[PDB]
Design a protein that fits this description.
Chain lengths: 220, 218
DNA sequence: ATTATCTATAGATCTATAGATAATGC
DNA sequence: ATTATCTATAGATCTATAGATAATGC
């Protein structure tokens, strides 16, 4: 059996331990209703525990949110940095970054890309993340600037990319689990679009090659 | 109220007191969002006591719901009328993108942010909710008419909405309305939207669009 | 007389803490 | 004798409602 006074209701969330369970419940609610609207009771209720019982695992509702926010921002930011610097031309580099971030935002169980864009993040409190967020944004812009020059279109590939957030499911079924063998269709499209808005022909063997860069990046 | 107003005088802008509210509300709701924003915070911004707001509006919900209506309907009617008008699907699509972006750049605050708010889950919100989905269909429909049954039919709407990130939200209007001008951003996004669908650009798309506006105004 | 605001305040939340309690582990 | 949950509540803060009150109109 398990140490500790047994809970009133049986666990309802997927997780190897209460931390994962709570973050699981939290990711669903925060992506559906945002931070402020979601109350610790609903989180508790979702998890199947009393509200106070949360505080043994997380010191504050803000800390829960922070944790989730890290787990999406981090991999995405580093990935762009890792890929940013490679063999090919900026057409190819940008096509990959778009495909790679879309691959990623489709890989998670809940739609955590929706967290970046929430109001709460605007506050100064969450400055470490604006920082990473802008840094990411700048990578794309500069990539795009290498193709069209100083031109307002350079702003677009990033917004095209983030558009998956509006077009993916959010019910705890992963829309496209990761595969070393292939890229999800939707990634192909948004990469392909991101080059069309810059008026640039698609690069060569782009799916075959983008998976190469990911294998590389994964080993790093 | 002849002559320039005092700097001290209530910072808000509008014909009457209700409008002063919605002006205050839009600034707060599009920066911090609905739930994070207290009626107290609104009142202070309007220069009045918290309780007073309840003369003009029933609830904090109602303020917000109103602000939504005030930005959707204008767009929904715009799109619907251009939607049928006699021209090619590309031309129709370009005009809609351009004029939606034109419109989202016309307002004082960035009311497009209210769309991305997740607060719209309530039963009452349904009227707004299904009108948002109607507008969105117009785009999908048009796009599909250019490119068929293709996942790219989703793009033009989202490309359009991206202007929300590219806009200021400090009170100054980014691009005031005009009948002989489209802001550069609306042109860009409209061009992009057609670009992603592999569609040819109409040669006189700007001026044709400025015309269907004038025509659709009266 | 009709407004538009005010002061005051219930009651409905919501976060977090204090301390009891029931399971395992020694 | 350690751990993880529970019950119970303090203290905050927020929406909304009453009923008082300073302006004018008539």
């Amino acid at each position: 059996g398990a140490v500790g006074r047994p809970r009133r209701s049986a666990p309802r969330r997927a997780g190897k331990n209460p931390r994962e369970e709570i973050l699981d419940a939290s990711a669903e609610l925060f992506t559906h209703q945002g931070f402020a609207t979601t109350s610790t009771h609903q989180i508790a209720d979702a998890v199947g525990i009393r509200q106070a019982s949360l505080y043994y695992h997380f010191p504050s509702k803000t800390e829960i949110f922070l944790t989730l926010l890290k787990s999406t921002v981090e991999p995405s930011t580093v990935l762009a940095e890792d890929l940013s610097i490679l063999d090919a031309g900026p057409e190819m580099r940008l096509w990959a970054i778009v495909a790679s971030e879309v691959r990623l935002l489709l890989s998670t169980k809940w739609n955590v890309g929706r967290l970046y864009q929430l109001p709460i993040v605007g506050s100064e409190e969450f400055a470490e993340y604006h920082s990473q967020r802008e840094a990411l944004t700048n990578i794309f812009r500069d990539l795009a600037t290498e193709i069209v020059g100083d031109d307002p279109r350079a702003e677009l590939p990033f917004h095209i990319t983030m558009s998956v957030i509006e077009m993916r499911r959010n019910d705890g079924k992963i829309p496209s689990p990761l595969s070393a063998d292939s890229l999800p269709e939707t990634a192909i499209m948004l990469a392909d679009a991101s080059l069309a808005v810059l008026g640039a022909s698609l690069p060569a063997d782009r799916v075959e090659k983008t998976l190469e860069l990911i294998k590389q990046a994964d080993a790093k």
